Amino acid sequence: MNIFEMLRIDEGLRLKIYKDTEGYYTIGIGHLLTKSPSLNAAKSELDKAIGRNTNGVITKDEAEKLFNQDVDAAVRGILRNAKLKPVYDSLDAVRRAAAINMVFQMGETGVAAFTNSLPMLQQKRWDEAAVNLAKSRWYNQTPNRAKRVITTFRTGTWDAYKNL
């Protein structure tokens, strides 16, 4: 298991434009295109992302290319953020993966709520952090996806992803 396999489990893979859990146009492995309700606007973003005039449809190779870019962007975002970087630096590699997921194409509200749990993570108060995390908006929206990520933070193991 690793961050790529982890997010592949949590996001799935779809090669045609679809709507994510918030109703936003998305493609591939959870690549958010736009928050606009316009499918045309979504298609425009897709073409710009891929570098060709698509039919709202991409290949698996293209989906994986975007995915790698998005994983990179998440790590980049963490390392450039004054609140996230020290917590990330403080974590083991398994828990770092959980952070990458929480940061991966996450809403501003999700990030806001996650920030509140950062103190617990950095102190390595795992059970307390887990409880505090369950209060987050991410958990309310997708209790299952949040439960896996929280279990990863709580245990520092891949146990929540091993049956998957």
- 127 flagged as catalytic: no
Q: Is 18 helix (H, G, I), strand (E, B) or coil?
A: strand
Contact 152, 160 (CB under 8 A): yes
Supply the angle between the helices 143-155 and 3-11 in degrees, to the nearest 10.
Answer: 160
Structural domain that includes position 55: 1-164
Structural domains in the chain (count): 1
Binding-site residue set for substrate: 32, 104, 117, 132
Expt. technique: NMR
In a 13 Å sphere around the CA of 141, the CA atoms on its Cβ side amount to: 13
* Catalytic pick among 10, 11, 45, 62: 11
Q: What is the CATH number of the domain that holds 110?
A: 1.10.530.40
Which whole-number Å values give the CA distances from 62 to 13, 26, 49, 90, 133, in the listed order?
11, 14, 10, 34, 33
Between CA 75 and CA 82 the distance in angstroms is 13
Element (H, E) at 2: none
Binding-site residue set: 32, 104, 117, 132
Between CA 158 and CA 39 the distance in angstroms is 37
Taking Cα atoms as reference points, which of 22, 49, 21 lies closest to residue 33?
Answer: 49
Q: What is the 3-state secondary structure (H, E, C) of 129-150?
A: HHHHHCCCHHHHHCHHHHHHHH
Q: Is 26 helix (H, G, I), strand (E, B) or coil?
A: strand
Breaks (C-N over 2.5 A) in the chain follow: none
* Catalytic pick among 20, 47, 64, 128: 20
- 11 flagged as catalytic: yes
Between CA 42 and CA 47 the distance in angstroms is 9
